[PDB]
Design an enzyme around this catalytic site. Structure first.
Site, short mmCIF file in Angstrom:
data_model
loop_
_atom_site.label_atom_id
_atom_site.label_comp_id
_atom_site.label_asym_id
_atom_site.label_seq_id
_atom_site.Cartn_x
_atom_site.Cartn_y
_atom_site.Cartn_z
CD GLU A 35 67.49 56.45 11.92
OE1 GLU A 35 66.42 55.60 12.16
OE2 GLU A 35 67.57 57.57 11.85
CG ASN A 46 56.62 57.34 11.01
OD1 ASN A 46 57.42 57.83 11.94
ND2 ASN A 46 57.35 57.18 9.70
CG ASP A 49 54.24 61.49 7.95
OD1 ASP A 49 54.53 60.70 8.69
OD2 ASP A 49 54.87 61.84 6.98
CB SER A 51 55.64 58.55 6.31
OG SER A 51 56.34 58.74 7.46
CG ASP A 53 60.98 55.78 9.61
OD1 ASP A 53 60.70 56.62 8.64
OD2 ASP A 53 60.82 55.96 10.85
CG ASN A 60 59.37 58.93 6.18
OD1 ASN A 60 58.93 59.56 5.26
ND2 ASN A 60 58.80 58.19 7.21
#
Length: 130
Positions: A35, A46, A49, A51, A53, A60
């Site tokens: 990750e 992102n 959408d 968002s 992380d 998220n």
């Protein structure tokens, strides 16, 4: 902070991650590894959408942490996403635990299903004294 492998493995164990909800330390290490490469200030926006992380686990913002700018988002961890960008991982671990309390478990992270599921993860904890 970018943790060294074994240094992180002991940190997680100390924090109660070893076998939390049946998820071994090796699986948690493999997750952090793919990750963020063990990096706490890791962030990925992102565009699709809207968002983002955050942190060592790349949690998220749509469902887990409040950043004030993800449309219709929720805060299941009761945390500012900023809390997941700290050097100390206590909050990120408490949020990670909350994520796995849900139905999917450790499967919530696609990277886990991609690079850790049905794989040999022994290598993440060997020699760490955990």
């Amino acid at each position: 902070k970018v943790f060294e492998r074994c240094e992180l493995a002991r940190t997680l164990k100390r924090l109660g991650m070893d076998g939390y909800r049946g998820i071994s330390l090796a699986n948690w290490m493999c997750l952090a590894k793919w990750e963020s490469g063990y990096n706490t200030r890791a962030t990925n926006y992102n565009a699709g959408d809207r968002s983002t992380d955050y942190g060592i686990f790349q949690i998220n913002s749509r469902y887990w942490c409040n950043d004030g700018k993800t449309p219709g988002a929720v805060n299941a961890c009761g945390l500012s996403c900023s809390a997941l960008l700290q050097d100390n991982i206590a909050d990120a671990v408490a949020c990670a635990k909350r994520v796995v309390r849900d139905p999917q478990g450790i499967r919530a992270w696609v990277a886990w299903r991609n690079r850790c599921q049905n794989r040999d993860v022994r290598q993440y904890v060997q020699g760490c004294g955990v």
